[PDB]
Amino acid sequence: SDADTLKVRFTLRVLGGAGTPSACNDAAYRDKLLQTVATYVNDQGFAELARR
Amino acid sequence: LSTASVLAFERKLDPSDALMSAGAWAQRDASQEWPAVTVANLPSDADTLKVRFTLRVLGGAGTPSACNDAAYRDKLLQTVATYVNDQGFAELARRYAHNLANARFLWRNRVGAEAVEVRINHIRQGEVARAWRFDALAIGLRDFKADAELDALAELIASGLSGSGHVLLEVVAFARIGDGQEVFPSQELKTLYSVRDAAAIHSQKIGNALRTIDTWYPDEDGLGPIAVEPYGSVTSQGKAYRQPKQKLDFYTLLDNWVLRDEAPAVEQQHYVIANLIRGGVFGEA
Amino acid sequence: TPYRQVSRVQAKSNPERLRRRLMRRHDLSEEEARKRIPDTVARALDLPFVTLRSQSTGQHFRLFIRHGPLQVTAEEGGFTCYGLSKGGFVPWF
Amino acid sequence: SVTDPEALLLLPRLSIQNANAISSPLTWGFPSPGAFTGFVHALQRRVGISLDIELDGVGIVCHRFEAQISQPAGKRTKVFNLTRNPLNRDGSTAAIVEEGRAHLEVSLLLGVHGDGLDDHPAQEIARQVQEQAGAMRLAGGSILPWCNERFPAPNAELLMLGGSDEQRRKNQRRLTRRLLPGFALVSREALLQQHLETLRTTLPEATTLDALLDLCRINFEPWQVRDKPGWLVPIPAGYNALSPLYLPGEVRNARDRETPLRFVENLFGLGEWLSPHRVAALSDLLWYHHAEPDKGLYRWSTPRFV
RNA sequence: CUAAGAAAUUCACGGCGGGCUUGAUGUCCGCGUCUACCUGGUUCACUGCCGUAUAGGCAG
């Protein structure tokens, strides 16, 4: 009844190593997957996703 | 046959709390009215101190107040009987008379003094029966066991410890500490110790200078007397002496002489009897 | 003998149990006595010196190391300040 | 006492949110020890080769526990709190495939063996392990790094082969000051076997007899309760093959086409939570996993704990 | 390389009307607490000793 302010705190951790799967069968699919993730990253940053 | 479990002795040579009054010199024998330290500002008219306590020398040595085994009771009483058939209490009594002779019950109100005189009065009624005067700076305080007309004060305490008379001693100590410095009474839990608005010394502190006897100990006799204590220790200087590893110690010398009837040339038994005069809850288990 | 010896002579300048009224009394009034000097700027805490006590003292009143007066000359007659003069003879061994 | 550690490493207070609380088809509660023995091996293949050290043992010390459970009205059992999953592309609600979760505050006594102890300082190893271990997940739950009002708890390290016998009770009684608000989980395999020939009245197996140590079972007045050997729990104790081993490509739904496969079952055992003052040496408290791949036994225990 | 890897429970609400808890009562009767001690260990800043800057008459 005497408090007017809500305080909400949490901790975020941003890990990184984004396009690497934690599971994949084909070595060819992982090889042409992380290359496509790299030609996303090397052509334009995470800055458009990072701003949002 | 073995040691009992519950045993206590009572404090023989019990002093009273020594009240300390100041006062100007050349009023010494007419010291009916010298005021005491009125608290915490001390004058310069009064140039000497006045420390008075009474001392009772009771009697009985190895009779416990509360024993637990009767065979141990009679064995301890016959050990004290074989000690007292050998000699009186006069060797301990002259060493108590040595601490009476100076004012070593003035602990730090004596170091730094130009003339200290101690007057001991053996009183039967309010009338004084025999008086004494000693000069504290000029008599001993260490050793060599030699001053005339002090042997009568020794024989008095030997009679009173052996029980040959009621002994009541009324002592006065005049300390010329100087022309009204600030003396130091005892201190309670910081506040100076009082009695009725007069400063004084505790009777265990007055009494601690009286059983400061023990010049016999394992080390060489170059440092002098220690207070007769079981596991004989010093509480503030730090050195806790008479370790029970080596055998010269009160509980060892008591339990091997009562139960195991030891008698070589061991006639320094005065430490054990001086502990029994001190009294205390001795053991047990 | 070295150039080592310690001293204690002259340390009595500004008492700390009695501070606020030693500053300006010359039998006159105080109209401006709140923002005269900032005493809140300095903050120091060290006392490694000999505790030497007297009557009505706590642990120790104060002293600060004011070293620098040292000679190889001992005391002289008639010139005493507290108990010792400028310098003296004591070596290490 | 296989592969005695030359150095213990104390990851001091790891705070974990939403760890898996089911842990087996039969048990629930604190998660499986195989999760911890896989976590130390995931540390080992991220910093263990870059520092030429060997993280192989792990000590499990639970300080604080909390489960998302709820007791229903009129039942003495518990049910698990759940999450709302996303919908389907049809617009309908998906199935409720229930999962148990728990919050978790843990300490990890690691054990280090290699030659990288003698090249790096003891403080280089502990940071590179700790700040790595804040990037990983323990039991399906996020390891939450420190921020608070107090101070972050630091990652120590002993060298338990170094020192005299006074240091061998000065060091191993210094870490126990940092492990004492919680309890340590050790493996008790000799109790469940000696309780099996203790049952001479019936001739059971270990299944019904591990179920007869979880009980606060009440004995008839000749009421009374049968005696307590300690705080005993059922733990998953490894796996056991129910298939022969398959060549590393002949299943096309494996996690990878380079490792052999077996279909396995679980393998249940006994464990005890105990205060670390009962522990003589803290290296005896560590969890290893040994395998017998010629058999189908893939299990884990604390050896050298008498 | 972790029974691995993934996840939004959400919206709304009138618990409420009424009431005699009484009456009565014997807690008694006995008792030995004792002996000893150094706060001579760092236990609040009480009106009359010419200026932080290293500088200045303490019969306290």
- What letters, b where the CB count within 10 A reaches 16 and e where it falls short, cover D70-101? eeeeeeeeeebeeeeeeeeeeeeeeeeeeebb
| Beta-carbon pairs below 8 A across chains A and D | 18
Place of tokens 């001392």: B55
Cβ distance of D145 and A11 shorter than 8 Å: yes
Output DSSP code: residue A20: -
CB D261, CB D299: distance < 8 Å: no
Q: Distance (Å, rounded) from C-alpha B2 to C-alpha B122?
A: 42
Secondary structure of chain B in HEC code, one letter for each residue: CCCCCCCEECCCCEECCEEEEEECCCCCCCCCCCCECCCCCCCCCCCEEEEEEEEEECCCCCCCCECCCHHHHHHHHHHHHHHHHHCCCHHHHHHHHHHHHCCCCCCCCCCCCCEEEEEEEEECCCCEEEECCEECCCCCCCCCCCCCCCHHHHHHHHHHHHCCCCEEEEEEEEEECCCCCCCCCCECCCCECECCCCEEECHHHHCCCCCEEECCCCCCCCCCCEECCCCCECCCCCCECCCCCCCCCHHHHHHHHHCCCCCCCCCCCHHHHHHHHHCEECCCC
Q: How much of chain A is in helix, strand and coil states, percent to nearest 5? A: 40, 0, 60
Write the CA distances from B28 to B18, B119, B131, B173, B176, integer angstroms: 18, 11, 15, 11, 12
Looking at CA atoms only, how far is residue A27 from chain D in angstroms? 8
Q: Distance (Å, rounded) from C-alpha D159 to C-alpha D167?
A: 10
CB B213, CB B225: distance < 8 Å: yes
> What contacts D268, CB < 8 A, 6 or more positions away?
D24, D26, D27, D207, D210, D234, D235, D236, D237
| CA-based nearest residue to D82, from D65, D69, D95 | D69
CB D39, CB D248: distance < 8 Å: no
**Closest-CA residue in chain A for D135?**
A15
Q: Which nucleotides of E are covered by protein (CB under 7 A)?
A: 1-9, 34-58, 60
CB B234, CB B240: distance < 8 Å: yes
Instruction: Kindly tell me whether chain C and chain A come into contact, counting contact as 3+ Cβ pairs under 8 Å.
Output: no
Secondary structure of chain D in HEC code, one letter for each residue: CCCCCCEEEEEEEEEEEEEECCCCCCCCCCCCHHHHHHHHHHHHCCCCCCCCCCEEEEEEEEEEEEECEECCCCCCCCEECCCCCCCCCCCCCCCCCCCCEEEEEEEEEEEECCHHHCCCCHHHHHHHHHCCCCCCECCCCEEECCCCCCCCCCCEECCCCCCCCCCCCCCCCCHHHHCCCCEEEEECHHHHHHCCCCCCCCCCCHHHHHCCCCCCCEECCCCEECCCCCEEEEEEEEEEECCCCECCCCCCCCCCCCCCECCEEEEEEEEEEECCCCCCCHHHHCEEEEEECCCCEEEEECCCCC
Instruction: Kindly tell me whether chain A and chain D come into contact, counting contact as 3+ Cβ pairs under 8 Å.
Output: yes
In sequence order, what DSSP letters do the residues of C26-54 get, joined into one string? SS---SS-SSSS--SS-------S-----
Place of tokens 């969890």: D287
Looking at CA atoms only, how far is residue A36 from chain D in angstroms? 21
CB B164, CB B84: distance < 8 Å: no
Q: List the determination method.
A: cryo-EM
CB D104, CB D62: distance < 8 Å: yes
Q: Distance (Å, rounded) from C-alpha B219 to C-alpha B228?
A: 15
Give me the torsion for CA of B133, B135, B140, B146, rounded to 10°.
Answer: -40
Write the CA distances from D255 to A17, A22, D249, D252, integer angstroms: 19, 9, 11, 9
Q: Distance (Å, rounded) from C-alpha D31 to C-alpha D101?
A: 10
Looking at CA atoms only, how far is residue A1 from chain D in angstroms? 26
CB D52, CB D119: distance < 8 Å: yes
Place of tokens 């030609």: A39
Separation of D40 CA and E2 C1' (Å): 9
Cβ distance of A24 and D142 shorter than 8 Å: no
Looking at CA atoms only, how far is residue A38 from chain D in angstroms? 22
Amino acid residing at D9: L
Q: Distance (Å, rounded) from C-alpha D179 to C-alpha D53?
A: 24
CB D129, CB D72: distance < 8 Å: no
Burial category of D8 from C-beta neighbours within 10 Å (exposed 0-12, middle 13-18, buried 19 and up): buried
Cβ distance of D254 and A25 shorter than 8 Å: yes
- What letters, b where the CB count within 10 A reaches 16 and e where it falls short, cover D122-134? eeebbebbbeebe
CB D7, CB D112: distance < 8 Å: yes
User: Looking at the C1' of nucleotide E43, which residue has the nearest alpha carbon?
Assistant: B190
Separation of B218 CA and E36 C1' (Å): 25
CB B42, CB B183: distance < 8 Å: yes
| CA-based nearest residue to D229, from D212, D244, D243 | D212
CB D25, CB D107: distance < 8 Å: no
Q: Distance (Å, rounded) from C-alpha C67 to C-alpha D252?
A: 88
Q: Distance (Å, rounded) from C-alpha D169 to C-alpha D301?
A: 25
| CA-based nearest residue to B18, from B52, B57, B55 | B52
| CA-based nearest residue to B279, from B180, B204, B219 | B204
Output DSSP code: residue C21: T
Domain definitions of chain D by residue range: 5-182, 183-302
Could you count the other beta carbons within 10 Å of the beta carbon of residue D43?
20
And the tokens for D21? 């609380």
Separation of D74 CA and E22 C1' (Å): 39
Amino acid residing at B175: A
**Closest-CA residue in chain D for A17?**
D135
CB D235, CB D185: distance < 8 Å: yes
And the tokens for B21? 């009054």
User: Looking at the C1' of nucleotide E54, which residue has the nearest alpha carbon?
Assistant: C66
CB B48, CB B176: distance < 8 Å: yes
Amino acid residing at B131: A
CB D233, CB D60: distance < 8 Å: no
Calculate helix-pair angle for B70-86, B250-258, nearest 10 degrees. 100
CB B115, CB B135: distance < 8 Å: yes
B240 bridge partner residues = B233
Q: Distance (Å, rounded) from C-alpha D188 to C-alpha D177?
A: 24
Amino acid residing at D79: V
Q: Distance (Å, rounded) from C-alpha D232 to C-alpha D269?
A: 11
Chains in contact with chain A (at least 3 beta-carbon pairs closer than 8 A) = D
Q: Distance (Å, rounded) from C-alpha A4 to C-alpha C53?
A: 58
Calculate helix-pair angle for B270-278, B70-86, nearest 10 degrees. 120
Å resolution of this model?
A: 2.6
**Closest-CA residue in chain D for A21?**
D255
Cβ distance of A25 and D145 shorter than 8 Å: no
Cβ distance of D256 and A25 shorter than 8 Å: yes
And the tokens for D189? 């395999």
Q: Which residues of A touch D (CB under 8 A)?
A: 11, 13, 15, 23-27
Cβ distance of A27 and D257 shorter than 8 Å: yes
Separation of B13 CA and E30 C1' (Å): 39
> What contacts D288, CB < 8 A, 6 or more positions away?
D2, D3, D37, D56, D57, D300, D301, D302, D303
CB B252, CB B244: distance < 8 Å: yes
Give me the torsion for CA of B202, B205, B209, B210, rounded to 10°.
Answer: 60
And the tokens for B144? 């060599």
Q: Distance (Å, rounded) from C-alpha C50 to C-alpha C60?
A: 9
Q: 3-state class of C79 per DSSP?
A: strand
**Closest-CA residue in chain A for D254?**
A25
Q: 3-state class of C76 per DSSP?
A: strand
Q: Distance (Å, rounded) from C-alpha B151 to C-alpha B159?
A: 12
D110 φ, ψ (degrees, to nearest 5): -85, 170
Could you count the other beta carbons within 10 Å of the beta carbon of residue C91?
8
Give me the torsion for CA of B48, B213, B90, B85, rounded to 10°.
Answer: 160
Q: Distance (Å, rounded) from C-alpha D299 to C-alpha D2?
A: 15
Chain D residues with CB under 8 Å of A15 CB are 135
Q: What is the largest CA-CA distance in chain A?
A: 63
Chain D residues with CB under 8 Å of A30 CB are none
Separation of B284 CA and E28 C1' (Å): 40
And the tokens for B99? 């601490």
Amino acid residing at D91: G
Choose the mutation target among D103, D138, D253, D255 for the interface with A, i.e. most A CBs under 10 Å. D255
Cβ distance of D134 and A13 shorter than 8 Å: yes
CB D282, CB D172: distance < 8 Å: yes
Angle value at C-alpha B256, between B250 and B260, nearest 5 degrees:
160
Cβ distance of D257 and A23 shorter than 8 Å: no
* Terminal Cα distance for chain A, rounded: 37
CB C7, CB C69: distance < 8 Å: yes
And the tokens for C48? 């490694």
Instruction: Kindly tell me whether chain A and chain B come into contact, counting contact as 3+ Cβ pairs under 8 Å.
Output: no
| CA-based nearest residue to D122, from D152, D153, D156, D154 | D156
B22 bridge partner residues = B49
Q: Distance (Å, rounded) from C-alpha D43 to C-alpha D131?
A: 11
Separation of B169 CA and E40 C1' (Å): 27
Looking at CA atoms only, how far is residue A15 from chain D in angstroms? 6
**Closest-CA residue in chain D for A29?**
D256
